[PDB]
Amino acid sequence: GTENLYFQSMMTANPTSIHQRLDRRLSGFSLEQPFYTSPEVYALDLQHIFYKQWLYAVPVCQLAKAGSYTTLRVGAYEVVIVRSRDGEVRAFHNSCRHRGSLICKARQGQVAKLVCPYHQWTYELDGKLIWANDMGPDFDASKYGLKPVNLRNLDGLIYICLSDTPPDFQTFAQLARPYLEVHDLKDAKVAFTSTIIEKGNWKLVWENNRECYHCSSNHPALCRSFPLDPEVAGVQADGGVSKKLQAHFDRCEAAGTPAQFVLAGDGQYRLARMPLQEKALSYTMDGKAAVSRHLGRVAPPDAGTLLMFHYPSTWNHFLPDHSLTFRVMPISPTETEVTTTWLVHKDAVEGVDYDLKRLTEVWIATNDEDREIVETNQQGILSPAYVPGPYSPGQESGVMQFVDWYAASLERALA
Amino acid sequence: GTENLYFQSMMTANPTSIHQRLDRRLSGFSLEQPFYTSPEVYALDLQHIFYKQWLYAVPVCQLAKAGSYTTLRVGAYEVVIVRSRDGEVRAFHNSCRHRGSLICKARQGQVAKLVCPYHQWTYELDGKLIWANDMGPDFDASKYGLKPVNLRNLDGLIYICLSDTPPDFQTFAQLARPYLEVHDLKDAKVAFTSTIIEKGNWKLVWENNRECYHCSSNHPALCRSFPLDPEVAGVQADGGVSKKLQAHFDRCEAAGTPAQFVLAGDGQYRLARMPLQEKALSYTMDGKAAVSRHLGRVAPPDAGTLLMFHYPSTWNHFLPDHSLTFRVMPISPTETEVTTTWLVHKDAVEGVDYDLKRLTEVWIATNDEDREIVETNQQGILSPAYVPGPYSPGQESGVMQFVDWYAASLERALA
Amino acid sequence: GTENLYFQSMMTANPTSIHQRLDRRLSGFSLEQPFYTSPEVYALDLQHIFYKQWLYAVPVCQLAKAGSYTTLRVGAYEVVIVRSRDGEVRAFHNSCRHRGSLICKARQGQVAKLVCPYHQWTYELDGKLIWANDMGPDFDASKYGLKPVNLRNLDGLIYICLSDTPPDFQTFAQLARPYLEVHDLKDAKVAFTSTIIEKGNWKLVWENNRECYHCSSNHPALCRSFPLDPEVAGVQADGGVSKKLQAHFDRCEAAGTPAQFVLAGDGQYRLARMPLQEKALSYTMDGKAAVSRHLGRVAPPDAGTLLMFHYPSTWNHFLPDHSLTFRVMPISPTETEVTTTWLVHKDAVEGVDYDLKRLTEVWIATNDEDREIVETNQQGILSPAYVPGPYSPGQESGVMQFVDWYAASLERALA
Ligand SMILES: CN1CCC[C@H]1C(=O)O
Ligand SMILES: CN1CCC[C@H]1C(=O)O
Ligand SMILES: CN1CCC[C@H]1C(=O)O
Ligand code: FES
Ligand code: FES
Ligand code: FES
Ligand SMILES: [Fe+3]
Ligand SMILES: [Fe+3]
Ligand SMILES: [Fe+3]
């Protein structure tokens, strides 16, 4: 399979020479092999991208209850996110300060205190070490609380940053709020979660995500509701919006629902509320709303889909009736974890207000089709005969946009 | 298992120092550990041996039909071999020139055109890019056809070479033709294929193949039909042929069937038509022909077995009634893929002219026994206590011959 | 799982800089990450610790019969231990001197001679090559006997050393004999063996073993019979023995059973006969003897447990009724094999004198609980946020003792 091909390919690969490769890179072409296949570049992507930027973790509604927690792995980091006694959500390194053990072993739960399973060093929900057995009179517990992790709440969506010197989150947060607040995500519940591993590099997952050049042949279910128009998927709107699209933005905004396409100065994130195809209202097989009790106050009913990406961790679709978040996490040079979360109103009842299959089938199928595509792409790229090829200017503008953001971010980090 | 032992062994291994190891190598001894166990030597074997020499791929009869194709992996290369519209068989890198994707995902099939599953760039069966959607007015498709792979047809057997500067194939092809043509391989069909992975280095598979020192204890089925006489398996005939053997060569050649032992000047290949044991006619449990409708025009009926090896990819047995090809492909430092293909006349009918079990049981068993032997050999070699030992001059002349060819080829490539 | 976390963690890890890390190490703290996670340190641990020190292999009673043998893997070494024709137990490298093959493929068995399965080079049970087929007149078999492995018999327990220059074993052997001889281990049989792989570094297995700081929360079955008192598990007795403990040592020694705590000058090994909790006599759920026919002549019946450790390979519990040996063998940087062997009197009859479940359930459970603990510890340590933490002086004195022995041994080896 791909794991073998990965080993085979790295055996004869030329040196990574990253500065030389970055120097000769042209924006209109796919990346040279080792960006997608080498452990050297993968290590740089972890150190300089995933461990330095803000990352989407989970919806805040998963931490609704007192003492609730959820855990996730980011690269080699094990993080626990908890609702503290004061109602604040905080994140910590899930590593006991005694001898290093994980403290929370389950993916989610509720606790009164964080108690290490090894020797029961006990921490308060704010990270403070409040009991350590028989450590002697010269032990200073104030030096041994859990190590915090930088955390922000983006209007009901929890973001974290593993750096001691996180970049600016506030510009993004301020920009996004008008678009997100109308979805009332703090009042959501998780209706379903799907976690899959795709056997391709995280950048291949993103390049695939940032175009619909592949969609008509590969996504029969999605194409019923999501338009193939390159302006929707891509970033050609940044230079100017078509009349048809602006007319949609205006219908939304006349109705009080922010829609207008906005792209970060540095290209890290984009928000836009795009029309669905034809008469579709939601990502379903019949095109109608999946949930009869809407999540948020979006108007009009055919307001379409709020697209939001924030590199490197997340793309999202916020519809009038429900919302979907996607989290991208690196597993190895040729493996990527994608977590899709369906959010519905907290009072929407499964079997009454929505049907689980009807709610999820379209994107379950789509993700599976994307995974197959990404994996097939990865296998060809592993050939030593692979060379960069040209992106379509009309169909892949969004791919070039992502690859530029990635290369610039890496260049800056290596400076 | 062996994968663990591989990791354990490389941890404490001395540096590879390949030039120093090559310098001190004596031809009468097995190779020092890292030749059989190290990823450093494995990488050199791929780069300098498998990616530079002509390799057996598949019988041409698998590409009998219009638009037929077959795919194979050689190291990290994914290759597709196709019968083009003009009747020519060509090979290409199975990597789309857009973003790199595999084009043909199945092991075999038929197509009208080669259509990439990702964004449907469409290629003619000669590799030319004939359609690429929405690539703009400055896109030159003539720069983006599939990359060709050097290919030859050795009398019904397809060989390929991954180098842009392939070595001479013509000397071998010219020498082999008289021996092969009488088997009419272009009129064969594949009756059966067996693919196994042996957990030993590709060179251990070859060293095992090039002797029958192990045969009497390890191959009860084979020994019924294949002689143990070292002159048969080995290369002592190169210095002079025994009277008994020459008498066999003469029976064949008086009957118009080329038999005489011939060995390449550089040792890369050897052809010889050798007698079977006793009264055996074929590789069966009862010694009689497996197929009643013969593949080719070999005479007399006890002409025996045409042995042909061509390093590094193939050994072969061509009998009067059917033929067997073996393809050796490297998987990792301690793994090798061996593909055995049974060829019979295209009009031979399974259940009438041959029985599948009767046709295949002997070599299925033999390959399994060889695999066990090679794997057991590999495990001992992984010990840091392993040191070269002496080959038997009488029983292992053919092993020394292979190891010399390998070492010389590596020396020349590193020069 | 852990294998992924291992790969993730090594990607961004700082250089190992082992001399710098060793230089700054403080004895009161857990080790810096790469000691527990890096392949570089693992390679040094194999080369300088496991391949240089004496290691426990198996009880001699497994080699009771003529021509009996047993095999084990130590790192990448494959070793065979055999009872020779003269009654001596010897060990050899299980690698044929011809081409390297394993000779003995089974874990245990009996043979007349050691016959290589490949080409049947035949060795006497003392390693001498007595037959090699068709090797020519200039073959000197005296140069090609099996390579010996240094072996000692510690009062019924077989120890080996992979170095050509083994350290002193005699000081340990002489010290241990009075304690061990009363267990009559030469008259034992193996009642049961359990082999498990724990997904943590071998040093984490040892650090866990050398404290009961974790025991009250994690070992309900064990705590019924094994005391939590830090003086029992640890090495605080080295500076002076409590009155209660000395009273126990005196009961044993008045009765002729050596008990007194003794610790090696260099800390490599320790023997002590410790009291069990409450009225317990053995490691059972009811606290009574597991076997009605005792192994050895220990007195009094509540003499408790003879604890013996010898780094890096073994800890042991010798009770009045039966004994348990534990063998620690490295598998990878984050994997360790632990083999627990229950020894009972050779005439003790399963189903009459002991019940298999009753005999083994306590330590089967305990080992499983330890494995979970070690694996959870390993996962947290893999975080790049992991930093050394302080050991409990009162509860983890034995952990510091082991870590000191390890660091000193590595320092000396690198000198
Ligand atoms: C639906 N795909 C194609 C382009 C947009 C992307 C998304 O999920 O945002
Ligand atoms: C049958 N074995 C032993 C020597 C020849 C080899 C072969 O398959 O060509
Ligand atoms: C029972 N554990 C805790 C300390 C002693 C250790 C042992 O098995 O020797
Ligand atoms: S590792 Fe957490 S209390 Fe010891
Ligand atoms: S990768 Fe083949 S058409 Fe895009
Ligand atoms: S490898 Fe043992 S006899 Fe040949
Ligand atoms: Fe898609
Ligand atoms: Fe064989
Ligand atoms: Fe324990």
First-to-last alpha carbon distance for chain C, in angstroms, is 37
Experimental method: X-ray
Chain A residues with CB-CB distance to C217 below 8 A? 117, 119-120
| Number of other residues whose CB lies within 10 A of the CB of residue B18 | 17
Select from B112, B188, B94, B193 the least CA-distant residue to B149.
B94
* Farthest-apart Cα atoms in chain C, separation: 74
Q: C288 CA to chain B: closest CA distance, Å?
A: 40
Binding residues of B for [2Fe-2S] cluster: 96, 98, 116, 119
Domain boundary at B143, B169, B195, which?
Answer: B169
Same domain, A287 and A367: yes
Pairing of strands C108-110, C55-59: unpaired
A345, β-bridge pairs: A188
Question: In a 3-state reduction of DSSP, which class is residue C345?
Answer: strand
Whose CA is closest to B336, among B309, B314, B318? B314
Assess whether B264 and B357 both reside in one domain.
yes
> Using a CB-CB distance cutoff of 8 angstroms, which residues of chain C are in contact with residue B213?
119, 133-134
Decide whether any atom of ligand 3 lies within 6 Å of the C324 Cβ. no
Helix (H, G, I), strand (E, B) or coil at C414: helix
Q: Is any atom of ligand 3 closer than 6 Å to the C-beta of C338?
A: no
Is C69 in the same domain as C136? yes
Tell me whether residue A7 is exposed, middle or buried, using C-beta atoms within 10 angstroms of its C-beta: 0 to 12, 13 to 18, 19 or more: middle
Interchain contact, A43 vs C12, CB within 8 Å: yes
Placement of tokens 């009807």 in the chain = A358
Enumerate the H helices of C219-269 as residue ranges.
230-233, 243-254
Using the atom order of ligand 2, give the atom closest to the CA of residue B233.
Answer: 4
Length of chain B counted residue by residue: 415
Question: Cα angle vertex B62, ends B58, B63, to 5°?
Answer: 105
The residue among B148, B169, B190 that closes a domain is: B169
Which residues in chain C touch residue A119, judged by CB atoms under 8 angstroms apart?
A: 213-214, 217, 392, 395
Tell me if A389 and B100 make a contact (CB, 8 A cut-off): yes
- For residue C129 the two structure tokens come to 């090559």
Regarding whether B183 and B82 lie in a shared domain, the answer is: no
Helices A397-414 and A202-209 pack at an angle, to 10 degrees, of: 140
Residue C108 is given by DSSP the state E
Give the end of a domain, one of B169, B199, B219. Answer: B169
| Closest C-alpha to ligand 6, atom 1 | C99
**Per-residue DSSP letter, B182:** G
| Residues in the annotated binding site of B | 96, 98, 116, 119, 214, 219, 370
The dihedral sign for the CA sequence A375, A379, A382, A386: negative
Same structural domain, B216 and B360 = yes
CB of residue C116 inside a 6 A radius of ligand 6: yes
Please, are residues C345 and C294 in contact by the beta-carbon 8 Å criterion? yes
CA of C349 to the centre of ligand 9 (A): 30
Q: Which residue has the tokens 């020394």?
A: B400
Looking at the DSSP bridge assignments, the partners of residue B324 are B317, B342
Q: A155 near A185, Cβ under 8 Å?
A: yes
B158 and B9 co-located in one domain: no
Please name which of A311, A317, A221 lies closest in space to residue A274, comparing C-alpha atoms: A317
| Domains in chain B, number | 2
Nearest to A95 among C12, C380, C393 (CB): C380
Rounded-to-10 torsion of CA C87, C88, C91, C96? -50
Interatomic CA distance for residues B274 and A329, integer angstroms: 60
Residue A21 sits in a domain whose CATH number is 3.90.380.10
Determine whether the shortest distance from the Cβ of C117 to ligand 6 is under 6 A. Answer: no
Tell me, what CATH number does B84's domain have?
A: 2.102.10.10
C29 close to C391: Cβ distance less than 8 angstroms? yes
- Residue C162 Cβ < 6 Å to ligand 3: no
Residues C157 and C288 in one domain: no
Locate C309 and state its tokens.
Answer: 């450790």
Edge to edge, the sheet with strand A68-74 lists A55-59, A157-161, A148-154, A89-93, A77-83, A68-74, A108-110
Test B100 with A395 for CB contact under 8 angstroms: no
The DSSP 8-state label assigned to residue C157 in this structure reads: E
Q: Return the SS3 of C153.
A: strand
What is the span of the domain harbouring residue A83? 51-169
B148, closest residue in chain A (CA to CA): A385
Same domain, A354 and A403: yes
What's C47's DSSP letter?
A: I
Does A307 sit in the ligand 1 pocket, CB within 6 Å? Answer: yes
Q: Over B48-64, what HEC string results?
A: HHHCCCCEEEEEHHHHC
Q: For residue C40, what are the contacts with CB-CB under 8 A and spacing of at least 6?
A: C16, C18, C34
Residues B366-369: contacts with CB within 8 Å, 24+ apart?
B366/B219, B366/B221, B366/B222, B367/B194, B367/B196, B367/B338, B367/B340, B368/B196, B369/B218, B369/B219
Looking at the structure, do residues A73 and A85 belong to the same domain, yes or no?
A: yes
- A7's CB contacts (< 8 A; 6+ apart) are B332
Amino acid found at C287: G
Residue whose tokens read 């090699």:
C132
The pair of structure tokens assigned to B239 is: 């210095």
Ligand 1 atom with minimal separation from the A233 CA = 4
- Number of the ligand 2 atom closest to the C-alpha atom of B226: 1
Residues of A in Cβ contact (< 8 Å) with B143? none
**Could you tell me which residues come within 8 angstroms of residue B381 by beta carbon, excluding any fewer than 6 positions away?**
B33, B36, B37, B204, C95, C99, C100, C101
Residues having C-beta closer than 5 Å to ion ligand 8: B 370
A133/C392 Cβ within 8 A: yes
Q: Which residues line ligand 5 (CB under 6 A)?
A: B 96, 98-99, 101, 116, 118-121
A107 ligand 4 Cβ < 6 A: no
Is the domain of A98 the same as that of A181? Answer: no
Nearest to A80 by CA among A51, A64, A52, A58: A58
Q: Where are the beta strands (DSSP E) in B174-319?
A: 188-198, 262-263, 269-274, 305-310, 314-318
List CB contacts (< 8 A) between C12 and chain A: 43, 46-47, 51, 75-76
Using alpha carbons, list the distances in angstroms from residue C369 to A310, C84, C209, C328: 43, 40, 12, 16
Resolution (angstroms) equals 1.8
Subunit contact C392:A75, Cβ cutoff 8 A = no
H/E stretch holding A273 reads strand A269-274
Residue ID of nearest Cα to ligand 3 atom 7 = C209
Q: A281 and A390, same structural domain?
A: yes
The CA distance from B167 to B268, in Å, is 12
Cα distance from N-terminal residue to C-terminal residue, chain B: 37
Cβ of A135 within 8 Å of Cβ of C218? The answer is no
Closest CA to B325 of B310, B336, B335: B310
- One domain, residues A138 and A200: no
On whether C119 is known to bind a ligand per the annotation, the reply is yes
- Identify residues of C whose CB sits under 8 angstroms from chain B CBs: 39, 42-43, 46-47, 51, 73, 75-78, 93-103, 105, 117-120, 133-136, 139, 144, 147, 331-332
